Amino acid sequence: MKLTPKELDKLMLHYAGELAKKRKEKGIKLNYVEAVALISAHIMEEARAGKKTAAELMQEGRTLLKPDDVMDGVASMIHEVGIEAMFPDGTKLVTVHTPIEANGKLVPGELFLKNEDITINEGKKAVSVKVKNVGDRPVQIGSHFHFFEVNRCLDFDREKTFGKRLDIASGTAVRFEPGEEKSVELIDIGGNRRIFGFNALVDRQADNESKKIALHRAKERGFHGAKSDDNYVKTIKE
Amino acid sequence: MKLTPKELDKLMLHYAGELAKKRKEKGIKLNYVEAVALISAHIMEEARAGKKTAAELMQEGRTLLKPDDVMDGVASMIHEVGIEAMFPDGTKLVTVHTPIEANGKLVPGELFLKNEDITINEGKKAVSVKVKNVGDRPVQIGSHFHFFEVNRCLDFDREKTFGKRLDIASGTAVRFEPGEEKSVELIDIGGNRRIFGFNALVDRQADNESKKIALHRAKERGFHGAKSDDNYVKTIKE
Amino acid sequence: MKKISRKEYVSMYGPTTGDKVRLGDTDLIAEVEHDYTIYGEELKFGGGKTLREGMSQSNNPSKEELDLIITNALIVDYTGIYKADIGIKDGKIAGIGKGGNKDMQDGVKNNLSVGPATEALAGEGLIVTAGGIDTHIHFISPQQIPTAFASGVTTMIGGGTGPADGTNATTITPGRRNLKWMLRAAEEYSMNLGFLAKGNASNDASLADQIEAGAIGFKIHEDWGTTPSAINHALDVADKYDVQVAIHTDTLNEAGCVEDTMAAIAGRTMHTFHTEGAGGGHAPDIIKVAGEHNILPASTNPTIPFTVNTEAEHMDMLMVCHHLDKSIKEDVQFADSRIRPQTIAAEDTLHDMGIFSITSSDSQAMGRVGEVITRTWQTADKNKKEFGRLKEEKGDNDNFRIKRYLSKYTINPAIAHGISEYVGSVEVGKVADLVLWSPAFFGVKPNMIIKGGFIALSQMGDANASIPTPQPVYYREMFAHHGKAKYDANITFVSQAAYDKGIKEELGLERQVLPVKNCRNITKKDMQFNDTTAHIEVNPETYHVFVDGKEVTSKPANKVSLAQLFSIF
Amino acid sequence: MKKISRKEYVSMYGPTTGDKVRLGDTDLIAEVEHDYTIYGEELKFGGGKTLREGMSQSNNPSKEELDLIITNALIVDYTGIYKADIGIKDGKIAGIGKGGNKDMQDGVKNNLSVGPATEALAGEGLIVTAGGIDTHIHFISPQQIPTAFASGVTTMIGGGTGPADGTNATTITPGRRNLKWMLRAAEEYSMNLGFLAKGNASNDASLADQIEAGAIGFKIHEDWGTTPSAINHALDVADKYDVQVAIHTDTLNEAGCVEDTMAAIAGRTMHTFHTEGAGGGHAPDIIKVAGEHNILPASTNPTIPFTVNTEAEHMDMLMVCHHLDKSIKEDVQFADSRIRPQTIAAEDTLHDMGIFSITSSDSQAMGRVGEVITRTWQTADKNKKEFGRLKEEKGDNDNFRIKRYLSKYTINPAIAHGISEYVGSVEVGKVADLVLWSPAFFGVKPNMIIKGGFIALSQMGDANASIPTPQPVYYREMFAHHGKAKYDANITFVSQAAYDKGIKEELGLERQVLPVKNCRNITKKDMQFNDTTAHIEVNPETYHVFVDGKEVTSKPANKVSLAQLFSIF
């Protein structure tokens, strides 16, 4: 019975779950490890039985443990239990989110936040730009993408947005649905203001002289809303 | 409780068998791994109980699983289950052959053979030789042993068989029981026909000139049926 | 001469020409195309068998006397499904054909001479294939390596630095120092290893520094920023240094669409991950690039084969892989997928047609490392059940389909990453990275792995037992896995630049260090049995994929083979 | 697609599959068995031909880019008579098949990649064979080497120390010091060279010292005393050191007859000179040893083919070779020959039947060094005229006879002397010792010789001419023949013992020095197309030779081919 290391690990997990189940039958309130093992082992056994789908197992995993079956804090600590179970149609990942309702008594590692908002990009004035997605697919723009060089299917006054980025929380994104028109707030890019990469429209220091070169490049490459004069004077390096 | 790695492995196997048994109780049809583990764990437990012999366990292992208790193909896949079990008289290897009857529905890795026989040693004409075993023990000769140099207790016309081997499937053997006389078919040894090793009767190219030297050597060493002239003329190297 | 029944002959020596064997529990039937053996002279090892001193083991062997011989093996390879003896000498495949003793048998070449220095391995009734090559490996944990090895994968090309978030998302080993870390850690494992650098940089100097530090290629991943500038610069540096470039395109369409990405690629050889899109914003239009010549398309494990439960796990896998918190409204709103059952079903049919050339895992980042081979054969079996025999089959067998799907994970990734000179197939001169399967367990559980001419992993029973068979039997490391033997057995692939600069002596590596080559001048036409370049008309309004006009789709499989019959969990 | 007339196609590219070409002015017809080319993609060099930058010369070549490619060559080899491009890289044959540019042509393997570093050689309408191997060379004068080279022989194995009487009689380089003399003198010549030591010694220490000094084998010659004791000791030492033994048996029957010589040989591999006897006392019974497995029989030039004038010169050649003064009554009385026209005629038929495996010269000692190939093909043509097509011919061609007679001087001597790994055939991995013939001049006058991947000898016109063609055209040394290029081009064969002891550094040799191997474990069965072992019943009362009962004889040829049509003198 050639056993793979994955199978050996799953056997250990199953017997940890069996121990948790025996303790629960004895009436011991389960801790974090026991609760996670119990849920995982139950999901694995149901999948092996093969009468349920992954959706049914995701639903059923949330009914195994009542709030009174676990110690205080276990429900807060357990956010989701993932387990790769072998179904009749192969191995699938079953994820159970919030399997136990939080009692609220004890929250390990809980945050005690101030009731004061965080002001981001302080000292930077934001301008408003109307953007239309004339493409056929939604477009997501990150907080730190150079907005001048976004997808050419987005239509807006690119001259206004040269050297700027979205004024949103860093790591978040703004989505433009096709045909949809939105108004976004843009703030100047900080630091050295050297734009490199993106769509290679600038690839240099962002100033008024590089703005003309960027606009001419964008117009040549077909970026919507980029307006460059017909009589454009080239420089020695561009 | 000083535990050896063998004991740890056997504990893992026992709990794999326990899991298989629980699944069988639940009514899940066992797969290959579960069936093998179940049989092995049951044999180990019976041996530890110590009321049965190894023969009794070999018999009992074939009754654990019915054909309807396993998935299709498991019975075909499982040919024999070996397990080293600690009896009251030490560790013994219990082997259960064909523990599950094949349903015949699905045969993993099954062969679909042509209905045409394989002709071995094609183009080689076989001569027939009568061989008597005048010794007290049976003698097995392989398909590729130089038949001239076989056990000296076999009696036959060695001159006829110089340079020849048995005309049987390669890897099979012919057994001559003591006192028994058999007729065998011999074919010429192929390739370079350089005989080295065996009983060191030839140790050179097999031709008519080396035949005389081999016959004289066999007569001197007492090989039955080897007839060499009394007035034998030696060569410079022999 | 004598005639023996074919059943007895096959039981003794394995199938011969014209005999058919079912692969695993699937519906695929492989027919032995030809046999190198001479009937009646077969090599057998045992008590009174032929592999003995003076009969088949030569007493005057040739100077090319084999170190190891595998007897009566059914070689399944993209070069053909045939029966032969494999000779291994000095870590390479010395010869394929009829082995034995020239003194007592006919038709024995000098390179297949069995002598007193030869070990014997009975392959009768066993299938021999080349070791798998997984090219999307996220090196998140070293425990992936034994899992893939036990699954039958012998070469892992990928990137990562452990369970960092950059590695969880991307197949990238960034920088000279991290490359040194990974190359020196690689000495531990029994697996051929290759590492990819970070291609997401507009700095030619940085990219070249990574290549000279030892990466065999670049990975441009969306999570580090897949922009046209980065694609262009990475492709320029890779054309300079003869290394592959792999890409996982931009999901958000931030800088452009599939057309803009293809314009940045500009008809240069590129290896694409998730060519079906995997729910990205380029989907389903990114499937169109699978018809281009310069694109080598690969598909990941989770979406093949298309099953009832395939779509349920995709969002969880996507969120965890891309590191989006499920308790954050912004991250949940950001986690937008364009996945469709139409695309997931079309992926299997494209694999069957040969539009997709490489199968891989993307281990522990939307993909299972120990299921590349199993899921490839599940897809092959499902397509055989759905569409029947391919029109290219020249007989009552599935040999063409077998070869196509085997190339998907053996020779095609080797060609893509420029290591096909060393690995990828059972050919003379290649390194002896062989996998021995029993046909009942083919595609799911190998019998043993030969790494560099020595057995490295094997199914083994109780160590205290009187024979190797008794339970518990599981996969154990063999002697090629231990001591200084693993240094001789295993290969670290580096770029030619690093090899010339002497990366082996500089980093003190004890493994064989080999340079990759011929990565830039390959197209889709160079893939074996998977070179179909067809205009893929993708209607995104209807999410409909057409090749040569005909629409492509498949139905979800309610039950796949090689899944629950073979695994306890 | 388009169809062009076969006549025009053959004029442009040479014969293709199914086309037949006459060899020289003989009656032998060679049929192209198969063609590796893809029609419409043939490689041509010229003004507006295909071998140009970007069309067939790759702009992104593989790393195995060829150094030289021979285009559209008709390869005539023991492995088959076919049409292909021959790629040469690093002095070896890198590949055989369809070469060109992978970017613009289909079916081009990586090892046949034509690139900017590739030189082109138009082989269209030209036959390519392996260089000849002459194994009976009496190294009497160094002027033999250019003569054999111009005849088409690229390897010379023999012995001698200049025009000493011992060398005039025997093929022997006696002793460590004389072997050093010859090995250091060998640096001058453009020819692979191997030297045989004196086997006529009952001293194992002396024989082993010669082998370690660098000889590739032993020669036991009657003129130094061919006694059974010497034969036995030489065979023992040669089995110890894995080197060939050649024998020229006792003419006088001083110590014994053919039976005693064969008893001393004792079924060990032995290469026999003048297996027809050449008038010796062992004749005609020595022809019986040509049926034994362990004897590799060779026949010399002068007695093949049997002509009207064959018997007239034999006594003069014998006396001068054996150093018997023609003005001395005792020496004239001693010079007794047992030669018969029956034996001379039977020699040609034995060659046709494959009983005799090797053709050689015995240069300037009863044999002509520059006529081995010519006389082999004269014998083949004479036998074709006499007995018609062989029964082994599978078609309306003489391919089997061509292959048999070509093996007689290409692959069979290489196997006999343990150098078949390096030379003897046009195969991938062997050294590029190739001969280019025009089919009108096949077997008599080559077009050019490629030595170690570079042209070493060629027909050339006036040096002051505006083209290479105008008269006078004769054979001139090319650049591989000069400077330090000949060191890279040529090979000196030594024993494995000398190679291990470092004979190259010890003697300061600049040539490649290669060890011979697999000399002791070969029999007559290992000769290609010449492995016929038949009981040869020789009636010495009637001088009648029978094989399988049937008597063998041939009629003298009044006029042979390839003799007066091609040579002014």
Tokens representing D307? 């002509």
The CA–CA distances, whole Å, from C326 to A54, D290, D326 equal 19, 88, 112
Q: Give me the residues paired with residue C100 across strands.
A: C113
Cβ–Cβ under 8 Å, residues C133 and C414: yes
CB neighbour class for D488 (10 Å; exposed up to 12, middle 13-18, buried from 19): middle
CA gap D430, D423 in Å, rounded: 6
**Which residue, among D178, D188, D423, has the nearest Cα to D196 in the 3D structure?**
D178
Cβ–Cβ under 8 Å, residues D269 and D276: no
CA gap B12, B2 in Å, rounded: 16
CB neighbour class for D328 (10 Å; exposed up to 12, middle 13-18, buried from 19): exposed
Identify whether C305 is preceded by a cis peptide bond (ω within 30 of 0): yes
Q: CB of B196 within 8 Å of any CB in chain D? A: no
Nearest 5°: phi and psi at B164?
-125, 160
Supply the DSSP string of D476-519, one letter for each residue.
EE-GGGSTTHHHHH-EEEE-HHHHHHTHHHHHT--SEEEE----
Task: Give CA angle at D541 (D540, D543), nearest 5°.
Answer: 50
Distance of CA D12 to the CA centre of its chain: 31
User: How many contacts does A have with C, using Cβ atoms within 8 A?
Assistant: 177
Between helix D399-409 and helix D341-353 the angle, nearest 10°, is 110
| Kind of pairing between the strands at C68-77 and C80-89 | antiparallel
CA gap A41, A65 in Å, rounded: 13
**Which residue, among C511, C38, C34, C557, has the nearest Cα to C341 in the 3D structure?**
C557
**Cα-trace Rg, chain B:** 28
Q: Nearest by CB to B9, from C29, C438, C462: name it.
A: C462
Supply the DSSP string of D81-144, one letter for each residue.
EEEEEEEEETTEEEEEE--B-TTTSSS--GGGB--TT-EEEE-TT-EEEEPEEEEEEE-S-TTH
Nearest 5°: phi and psi at D265?
-60, -40
Helix segments in D253-313, DSSP class H: 258-265
CA gap A218, A201 in Å, rounded: 7
CA gap C2, C310 in Å, rounded: 56
CA gap C373, C152 in Å, rounded: 8
C258 contact partners, CB below 8 Å, separation of at least 6: C249, C282, C285, C286, C288, C289
Cβ–Cβ under 8 Å, residues C375 and C358: no
Handedness of CA C282, C284, C285, C289 (dihedral sign): positive
Supply the DSSP string of D172-184, one letter for each residue.
---SHHHHHHHHH
| Kind of pairing between the strands at A127-133 and C20-22 | unpaired
- Please tell me the experimental approach by which this structure was elucidated: cryo-EM
Residue with tokens 């079916």: D107
Cβ–Cβ under 8 Å, residues C70 and C434: yes
Tokens representing A144? 């730190």
Residue with tokens 């007839």: B227
Residue with tokens 């093969």: A50
The CA–CA distances, whole Å, from C406 to C306, C411, C425, D335, D434 equal 19, 8, 10, 74, 39
**Which residue, among C199, C271, C226, has the nearest Cα to C419 in the 3D structure?**
C271
CB atoms within 10 A of CB C283: 25
Helices (H) and strands (E) in chain C, counts: 16, 25
Distance of CA C394 to the CA centre of its chain: 26
C204 contact partners, CB below 8 Å, separation of at least 6: C233, C236, C237
CA gap B169, A124 in Å, rounded: 91
The CA–CA distances, whole Å, from D171 to C401, D222, D313, D482, D496 equal 61, 11, 21, 28, 21
Using CB atoms and an 8 Å cut-off, which of residues 133-162 of chain B contact chain C?
140-146
Q: Give me the residues paired with residue D434 across strands.
A: D130, D450
Tokens representing C119? 């070990």
CA gap B235, D155 in Å, rounded: 38
Q: CB of A59 within 8 Å of any CB in chain C? A: no
CA gap C513, C515 in Å, rounded: 7
Handedness of CA C248, C252, C256, C257 (dihedral sign): positive
Q: What is the 3-state secondary structure (H, E, C) of C38-53?
A: CCCCCCCCCCCCCCCE
CA gap D172, D162 in Å, rounded: 11
**Which residue, among C315, C167, C267, has the nearest Cα to C523 in the 3D structure?**
C267
Q: Which amino acid is at C227?
A: T
Q: Using a threshold of 3 CB pairs under 8 A, tell whether chains D and A touch.
A: no
CA gap C433, C149 in Å, rounded: 11
Q: Using a threshold of 3 CB pairs under 8 A, tell whether chains C and B touch.
A: yes
Tokens representing D87? 């790629």
C556 contact partners, CB below 8 Å, separation of at least 6: C306, C307, C308, C310, C341, C345
Adjacency order of strands within the sheet including B127-133:
B154-155, B127-133, B181-188, B164-166
Nearest 5°: phi and psi at A6?
-60, -45
Q: Give me the residues paired with residue D20 across strands.
A: D31
Helix/strand/coil for C143: coil
Supply the DSSP string of B128-186, one letter for each residue.
EEEEEE-SSS-EEEETTS-GGGS-TTEES-HHHHTTEEE-S-TT-EEEE-TT-EEEEEE
Residue with tokens 């117009």: A219
**Which residue, among C187, C191, C244, has the nearest Cα to C215 in the 3D structure?**
C244
Cβ–Cβ under 8 Å, residues D461 and D471: yes
CA gap D490, B45 in Å, rounded: 75
Between helix C258-265 and helix C228-241 the angle, nearest 10°, is 30
Q: Give me the residues paired with residue D352 across strands.
A: none
Cβ–Cβ under 8 Å, residues C530 and C354: yes
Chain C CB contacts of A172 under 8 Å are 330, 334
Residue with tokens 């309130």: A29
Cβ–Cβ under 8 Å, residues A30 and A71: yes
CB neighbour class for D309 (10 Å; exposed up to 12, middle 13-18, buried from 19): exposed
**Which residue, among D26, D19, D21, has the nearest Cα to D5 in the 3D structure?**
D19
Indicate the helix (H) or strand (E) that contains C537: strand C536-539
Asked if the Cβ–Cβ distance from D102 to C521 is below 8 Å, we say: yes
Supply the DSSP string of D335-391, one letter for each residue.
------HHHHHHHHHHHHHTS--EEE--TTSSS-GGGHHHHHHHHHHHHHHHH-S-T
**Which residue, among C314, C364, C327, C322, has the nearest Cα to C166 in the 3D structure?**
C322
CB neighbour class for A215 (10 Å; exposed up to 12, middle 13-18, buried from 19): buried
**Which residue, among D397, D383, D395, has the nearest Cα to D353 in the 3D structure?**
D383
CA gap D365, D167 in Å, rounded: 9
Q: What is the 3-state secondary structure (H, E, C) of chain A?
A: CCECHHHHHHHHHHHHHHHHHHHHHHCCCECHHHHHHHHHHHHHHHHHHCCCCHHHHHHHHHHCCCHHHECCCHHHHCCEEEEEEEECCEEEEEEEECCCCCCCCCCCCCCCCCCCCCCCCCCCCCEEEEEEECCCCCEEEECCCCHHHCCCCEECCHHHHCCEEECCCCCCEEEECCCCEEEEEEEECCCCCEECCCCCCCCEECCHHHHHHHHHHHHHHCCCCCCCCCCCCCCCCC
Residue with tokens 């410079």: B236
Helix/strand/coil for B220: helix
Using CB atoms and an 8 Å cut-off, which of residues 527-566 of chain C contact chain B?
564-566
CA gap D399, D389 in Å, rounded: 10
Indicate the helix (H) or strand (E) that contains B81: strand B80-87
Give this entry's resolution in angstroms.
Answer: 2.3
A224 contact partners, CB below 8 Å, separation of at least 6: A134, A152, A153, A154, A155, A156
D190 contact partners, CB below 8 Å, separation of at least 6: D145, D149, D451, D456, D457, D477, D480, D481, D486, D489, D490
D481 is catalytic: no
Q: What is the 3-state secondary structure (H, E, C) of D207-233?
A: HHHHHHHCCCEEEEEHHHCCCHHHHHH
CB neighbour class for A112 (10 Å; exposed up to 12, middle 13-18, buried from 19): exposed
CA gap D320, D326 in Å, rounded: 9
Tokens representing D167? 């060398």
Q: Nearest by CB to A48, from B12, B23, B37: name it.
A: B23
- List, as residue ranges, the binding site of D for substrate: 221
Cβ–Cβ under 8 Å, residues D366 and D317: yes
Residue with tokens 């899944």: C563
Nearest 5°: phi and psi at C341?
-60, -25
Q: Which residues of C499-513 are buried (b: 16+ CB within 10 A; e: fewer)?
A: beeebbeebebebbb
The CA–CA distances, whole Å, from D97 to D87, D92, D117, D426, D437 equal 8, 15, 19, 12, 19
User: How many contacts does B have with C, using Cβ atoms within 8 A?
Assistant: 218
Q: Nearest by CB to C518, from D62, D525, D526: name it.
A: D62
N- to C-terminal Cα distance for chain D? 52
Q: Give me the residues paired with residue D492 across strands.
A: D193, D513
Helix/strand/coil for D317: helix
CB atoms within 10 A of CB D327: 6
Tokens representing D540? 């010495």
Chain A CB contacts of B70 under 8 Å are none
CA gap C378, C371 in Å, rounded: 10
Tokens representing C92? 């390479």
Using CB atoms and an 8 Å cut-off, which of residues 362-391 of chain C contact chain A?
368, 370-371, 375, 378
Asked if the Cβ–Cβ distance from C48 to B93 is below 8 Å, we say: no
User: How many angstroms separate the CA of residue A168 from the nearest CA in chain C?
Assistant: 11
Q: What is the 3-state secondary structure (H, E, C) of A40-103?
A: HHHHHHHHHHCCCCHHHHHHHHHHCCCHHHECCCHHHHCCEEEEEEEECCEEEEEEEECCCCCC
CB atoms within 10 A of CB C331: 17
CA gap D62, D58 in Å, rounded: 8
CA gap C453, C91 in Å, rounded: 4
Q: Which residues of C140-152 are buried (b: 16+ CB within 10 A; e: fewer)?
A: beeebbbbbbbbb
Query: Measured over all CA atoms, what is the biggest interatomic distance in chain D, rounded to whole angstroms?
Result: 81
Residues in chain A: 238
CA gap D215, D194 in Å, rounded: 7
Task: Give CA angle at C503 (C195, C241), nearest 5°.
Answer: 60
Nearest 5°: phi and psi at C513?
-120, 120
Half-sphere exposure of D355 (CA within 13 A, CB side): 26
CA gap C442, C447 in Å, rounded: 9
Measured between CA atoms, the residue of chain A closest to residue B13 is: A1
Q: CB of A169 within 8 Å of any CB in chain C? A: yes
CA gap C480, C434 in Å, rounded: 13
| Kind of pairing between the strands at D119-122 and B90-97 | unpaired
CA dihedral C428, C432, C437, C438 (to 10 degrees): 70
Helix/strand/coil for C63: coil
CA gap B142, B173 in Å, rounded: 4
C302 contact partners, CB below 8 Å, separation of at least 6: C310, C313, C314, C317, C366, C367, C368
C452 contact partners, CB below 8 Å, separation of at least 6: C91, C431, C432, C433, C480, C488, C489, C490, C491
Between helix D204-213 and helix D228-241 the angle, nearest 10°, is 50
